[PDB]
Design a protein around this nucleic acid. Structure first.
Ligand code: ZN
Lengths: 159, 103, 218, 58, 142
RNA sequence: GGGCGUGUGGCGUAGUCAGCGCGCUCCCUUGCAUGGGAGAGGUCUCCGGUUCGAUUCCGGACUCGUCCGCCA
RNA sequence: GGGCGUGUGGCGUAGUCGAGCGCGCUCCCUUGCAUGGGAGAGGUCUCCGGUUCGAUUCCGGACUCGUCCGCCA
RNA sequence: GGUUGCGGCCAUAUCUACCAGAAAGCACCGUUUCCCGUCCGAUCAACUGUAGUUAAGCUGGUAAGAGCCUGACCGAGUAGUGUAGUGGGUGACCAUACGCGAAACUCAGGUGCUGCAAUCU
RNA sequence: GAAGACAUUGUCAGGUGGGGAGUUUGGCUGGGGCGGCACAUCUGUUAAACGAUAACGCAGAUGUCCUAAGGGGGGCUCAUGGAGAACAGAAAUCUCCAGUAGAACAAAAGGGUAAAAGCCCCCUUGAUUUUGAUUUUCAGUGUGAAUACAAACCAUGAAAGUGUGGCCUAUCGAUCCUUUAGUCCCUCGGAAUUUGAGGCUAGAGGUGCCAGAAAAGUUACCACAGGGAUAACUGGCUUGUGGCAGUCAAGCGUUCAUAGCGACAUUGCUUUUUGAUUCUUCGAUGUCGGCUCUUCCUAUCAUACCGAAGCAGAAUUCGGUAA
RNA sequence: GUGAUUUCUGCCCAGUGCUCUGAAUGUCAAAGUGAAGAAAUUCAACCAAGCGCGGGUAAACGGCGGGAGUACUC
RNA sequence: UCGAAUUUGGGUAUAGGGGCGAAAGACUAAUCGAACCAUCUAGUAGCUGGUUCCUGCCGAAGUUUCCCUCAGGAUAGCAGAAGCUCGUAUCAGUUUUAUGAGGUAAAGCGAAUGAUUAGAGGUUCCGGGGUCGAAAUGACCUUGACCUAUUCUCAAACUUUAAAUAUGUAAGAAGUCCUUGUUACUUAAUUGAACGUGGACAUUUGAAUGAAGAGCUUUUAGUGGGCCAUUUUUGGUAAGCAGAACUGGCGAUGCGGGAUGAACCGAACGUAGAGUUAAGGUGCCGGAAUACACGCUCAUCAGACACCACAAAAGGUGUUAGU
């Protein structure tokens, strides 16, 4: 018959990695999570308690509950034609903070600093990001850079 | 399996409310009484003509039964039940396993 | 009793090697892969000629055996048994299956059709690619015309299209002819049973001096 | 009389007809599943805060 | 439980079955198709272990038949008195509940105990009734 | 073609992850009848795996004996 | 029709590449309800080719025999 | 900068073979009454810092060293791949257009950094 | 005359009773039947690097086992190899060195684990009580399994802590009925006491066709509703198999590859074999063989004209145009 | 049941049936008896036929095997 | 066959689970493997057939889970209708930036596991065969193992590495910063946790593009046989075969082209006029150049356009161009 267990098809997903097996380092236990933090989920195969299901591997969610050794995380799961709210109790070995959130907060504080310093002059702050604009005019010189003519190479076996 | 004859466990007997000593037995069902309501209804339905009026089970599939331990608190005589998993062999006599001895 | 090779010409399935999930395969028909003067040294035979595929297909082990026998027989008849070194550079590891149907009259009374039609192993084949070498022969420069004719006779036993290319390398090595010549004039090559070991600028100097003494004899 | 076993054909079209609405998020999400020792103190903290604000703006 | 169900086709020769509430041991099995379209029927010929009678039953192959639990146990004789054997278990337990055999096995056992061999007795349990089937002699540990 | 069973000393076979009995060959004892003790004798069909260990547990192979292979 | 195996003295039968026994009867010896004993004869190892140094023996082909599976509605 | 105690990252830190180590600190080292544990005061326990020694541990250095780490326009825009055509080819498969882009290989360099507290010619 | 409170008769009760009555006699399925379980589940793969994903796909497994093989703590390091020591050797015990796991962890497989999750020792019962929340399957129902807490009460250790069974992924079961434990609480309705009975909360007895009927056959005497969703003809796709044709040439042919053949390989054609499939037909396309009769194909048996020969003649063989 | 005449109809009672004037506690209903109880009731003893034990029966249904030695014997 | 087990008239007897049968399931009023008549009865049917006027607007499904479920239902999905609260947003089958996750394609095997070709150098208290040796833990060769440095080829259930395409989250007002209130939680401690008071920061308020209104609710129909094409892919020799993944289609759809055709190419449709085109074409059928330009090919079976209606290996001083 068919087989769809709780950890089916999780072979390479829950292998550890090359040459970093063994016990886990103490930074994962010394990291501090608060309610509202945004965290990434990546399971550790060395810890069998508090494991996430294989669906939530690589998923990103929001902390809603902090307990003794675990963290409650909220994920949005697509079920059919809508998203449902899923609450997960995961031990802290299987989560880490999302770095995109802290990058955005750094942008927020630097952006507020720019607005605060330029408010003393009113110099059209222009605080929105802009994407890659087309590159403008330039003059390239041939002083020591005379062009070299290239041609297609004929065919050879090369074995 | 093997289960010891005594066990220190919780007793919710309204005076203990803690772990006390318990003597264990195996649960036996006891005889089905007459004048139970289902038995009276079954006898009334089976009287007369019409033959067998209720199903009788045939397609038996299990070979084991879940064992139930009857715990009895030694202080206040209150009783508890707890079930175990399915086992083909069961015993309450404690013949402890011993390790570094011969076959 | 054997099916024609057109039923197994193309690489239609995933590779199916003999393993602990097969456990019952027929042995390959080709068994000898290196022949001629296989114990010859490296600078005995400077010229190398390749029979190389132009198809993406499967070559049967029976066809490999027949081509090996044909090329070996022709070259030993025309040029001597120890004037060349032939090497078969493909190995049949893919296993071919057959769902055997009964050829009796009224077979459908006991056939069951396509139900449970997973096959049984009956043969071995080698999966080749575009520009993959099947045969490689090294010899002296006086046997070019006979090794090209030997490979041309062997090409008839193979399905698909094959090319005969005279390589620019020295023998069965991977350097060019003048590169190997300017390497062997120094002592930084040293012969083995058939191949040659090369000097590198890495490693411990004591080992690099107990081996390869003539290059350091500068 | 065999038949088709399973397919996922047309399913994404059916979903994306009037489909893949994100759930409505709210200020003050539900406190169910939150730790009871936290909620038991949180009730008294909000009660004291409401009493202090009522006494301030009475 | 004392007894467990099984399928007729799952049964095979030299196995125990329950026929008419008797522990029986099969000597013959034969399956014949009922009709060309229909399923085969199993005809079972078995011998009661205790009494030696021959009992036969035919059933559908898919039907489930009752199967006993038979345990064969090894003991040493202590005495044969009044038709009741007295046996001695490993770890020193003793039972006298077994009745002595009444046939040529019982006669041979009685003569062997009278002339003084150390006799090894096999007694079987099935469905709450107990009997002795065979005896040997201990070649070592005299 | 498929399925099931089968191989143990000459025979009967039994079995825990090779035993007896009757054969064989000696020796001893005592009839009316005997009996006892020694031996020679078994790659447990074969080959692998598993297991401390496999007759025993499993897989593959051989032999032999069975049972089906039907409706059109 | 096809597949698989088989072929030894008058008969049965043993054969690892280096034709023996038993039965029939040839003779001699030896005996009522007729024996035994001793020396005998007896093969192109089914046939034809190759290998070997020499094939019963290895291989290929043919013959022959014995098994197994096969037409229609 | 050396050393100790507790660490963080967990080989640039590991491994092999040699060489060196002032001061201090670690270490080996001396002892069995007491607590304690062993077949064995070897490990562990306790006592002394006394009788001694850098031989080892430890630290550092060396090696066209093994490994590991970093980089390259080194291989290679190669293999692979998203999209397109009433493209080629009997087919197997392959070119082109708009895009993305490896691994092995080769070469070059490197061989622990650092937090808190104490202590040192 | 006989018989006699016995037969008979009436009502209950046990046996017997296909003579008769009523009914049943699973599903999936390259047609059905036999076979198997793909019917409830688990591991790896197919599976196309989130998740999901089929086939009677491949390789296997489950209906158990364990008072320790659960929980806590302490000490130690395994498989293997090398070098040694009386009996003692290939394998008995002891000693040293190397040893990233090449061992072990109950079982199938895959993950995980080295001052441990392994081996040995010490103490225990957290495999306990009370109900909630969450994850997987999913309708975001049930069942099973699991996760993190709360309120107690315990175990262990110096302690931090750890523990709500087994290192993780499988190891299992509704309504009705019976029975057990708890509350010793509620009700027996004209009012009480005591038995008895019925309720509430939590378990057990089991449905493996595993979201759970109580169940043997035959029909060639057969019937009905339907089905080309589905088999037994032709036709159609395919050509394994059957038949026919090539290419290459190790050899046979006294000598000599190719007069005639031709191994090991390999490329095709045909639909006069048999399979495979199920597209058409089940409100019917008359189903073997023979007789009769016409036409077509050529892969030519004979006749016409030719080429080749291991063609002297005779006879024969190979081949061409030819139906 | 077999199917004139003639000539014969062998062996088997283990199974399934059928049948006994055998022997007698194993199974064992209702009524009845005894004990306990305040009673409903519960528990025992006793317990007919038939099953179970023991015989017969094949012109009853039916059945009529293997391994060795030299048809015959084991 | 015809003197009887004969043929037959009339009378009479046996009636439907009953009769009668020299036995065929025969006969019992053209009815028999249970007669005929009326009623229950308009018996039931998950099965077949049919189902009656127009126009307008919107517009599907053959998929999930459970069922003695597989020709049927329930449930979710797709669809319509009625709307309701608001007024440009708590949007998006899209991109960018930042940040995760994955183990396929590829690659690798002088990297682990497994398979595998060939020599070379060593090891014999530590192999086997021969020869020389009285023999020798003797010798010399050879062959096997094991080790060392190489070498050839591989892996759906191998892997250090590792894409492309898909995939999670974030890009603020429900935000940031400052100050200090509550608590029975927590800390050695106003330490922290959560929710707050008061104050400051506004249109470049925090990337692009578009928004066609955004959000919400009730109720109910039909459907739950699908099939085809490109790409990935499984079983099979293969199939107009069977089974999956993403998308687009047909079903449900006409129009121009492919002569012809459900699916291919182009393009989707109110009624008309004018112009321009797509795909496809311009000798004639047939609307449109017997246009222009450079070459190639002569076939005693030429060739002529994707899906698509077939041809291969091997050859040719045919002819052309090359190395
Ligand atoms: Zn108590």
């Amino acid at each position: 018959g068919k087989s769809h267990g709780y950890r089916s098809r999780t072979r390479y997903m829950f292998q550890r990695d090359f040459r970093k097996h063994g016990a886990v380092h103490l930074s994962t236990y010394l990291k501090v999570y608060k309610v509202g933090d945004i965290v990434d989920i990546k399971a550790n195969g060395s810890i069998q308690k508090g494991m996430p299901h294989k669906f939530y591997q690589g998923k990103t969610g929001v902390v809603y509950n902090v307990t003794k050794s675990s963290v409650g995380v909220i994920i949005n799961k697509m079920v059919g034609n809508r998203y449902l709210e899923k609450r997960l109790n995961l031990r802290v070995e299987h989560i880490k903070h999302s770095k995109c959130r802290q990058e955005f907060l750094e942008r927020v504080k630097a952006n507020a600093a720019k607005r605060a310093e330029a408010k003393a002059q009113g110099v059209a702050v222009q605080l929105k990001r802009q994407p890659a604009q087309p590159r403008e005019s330039r003059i390239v010189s041939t002083e020591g850079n005379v062009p070299q003519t290239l041609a297609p190479v004929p065919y050879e076996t090369f074995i | 399996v093997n289960v010891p004859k005594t066990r220190k466990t919780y007793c919710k007997g309204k005076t203990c409310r803690k772990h006390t000593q318990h003597k264990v037995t195996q649960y036996k069902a006891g005889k089905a009484s007459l004048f139970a309501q289902g038995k009276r209804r079954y006898d009334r339905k089976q009287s007369g003509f019409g033959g067998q009026t209720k199903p009788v089970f045939h397609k038996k599939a299990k070979t084991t039964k879940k064992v139930v331990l009857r715990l009895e608190c030694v202080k206040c005589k209150t009783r508890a039940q707890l079930t175990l998993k399915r086992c083909k062999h069961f015993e309450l006599g404690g013949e402890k396993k011993q390790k570094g001895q011969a076959l | 009793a054997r099916r024609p090779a057109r039923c197994y010409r193309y690489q239609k399935n995933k590779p199916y090697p003999k393993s602990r999930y097969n456990r019952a395969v027929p042995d390959s028909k080709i068994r000898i892969y290196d022949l001629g003067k296989k114990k010859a040294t490296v600078d005995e035979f400077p010229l190398c000629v390749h029979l190389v595929s132009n198809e993406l297909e499967q070559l049967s082990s029976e066809a490999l055996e027949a081509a090996r026998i044909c090329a070996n027989k022709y070259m030993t008849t025309v040029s001597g048994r120890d004037a060349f070194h032939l090497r078969v550079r493909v190995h049949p590891f893919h296993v071919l299956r057959i769902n055997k149907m009964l050829s009796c009259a009224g077979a459908d009374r006991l056939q069951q059709g396509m139900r449970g039609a997973w096959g049984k192993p009956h043969g071995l084949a080698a999966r080749v690619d575009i520009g993959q070498i099947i045969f490689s022969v090294r010899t002296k420069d006086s046997n070019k015309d006979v090794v090209v004719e030997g490979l041309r006779r062997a090409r008839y036993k193979f399905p698909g299209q094959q090319k005969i290319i005279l390589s620019k390398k020295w023998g069965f090595t991977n350097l060019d002819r003048p590169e190997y010549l300017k390497k062997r004039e120094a002592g930084e090559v040293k012969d083995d049973g058939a191949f040659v070991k090369f000097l590198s600028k890495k490693g411990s100097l004591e080992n690099n001096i107990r081996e390869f003494p003539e290059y350091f004899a500068a | 009389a065999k038949s088709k076993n399973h397919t996922a054909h047309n399913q994404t079209r059916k979903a994306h007809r009037n489909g893949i609405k994100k759930p409505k998020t709210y200020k003050y999400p539900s406190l169910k599943g939150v730790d009871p020792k936290f909620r038991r103190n949180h009730k008294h903290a909000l009660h004291g805060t409401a009493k202090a604000l009522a006494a301030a703006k009475k | 439980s004392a007894t467990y169900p099984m399928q007729c086709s799952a049964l095979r020769k030299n196995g125990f079955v329950v026929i008419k509430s008797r522990p029986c041991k099969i000597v013959d099995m034969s399956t014949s198709k009922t009709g060309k379209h229909g399923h085969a029927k199993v005809h079972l010929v078995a011998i009661d272990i205790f009494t030696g009678k021959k009992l036969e039953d035919l059933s559908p192959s898919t039907h489930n038949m009752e199967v006993p639990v038979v345990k064969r146990n090894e003991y040493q004789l202590l005495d044969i008195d009044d038709g009741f054997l007295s046996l001695m278990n490993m770890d020193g337990d003793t039972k006298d509940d077994v009745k002595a055999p009444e046939g040529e096995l019982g006669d041979s056992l009685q003569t062997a105990f009278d002339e003084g061999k150390d006799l090894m007795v096999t007694i079987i349990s099935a469905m709450g009734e107990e009997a002795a089937i065979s005896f040997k002699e201990a070649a070592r540990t005299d």
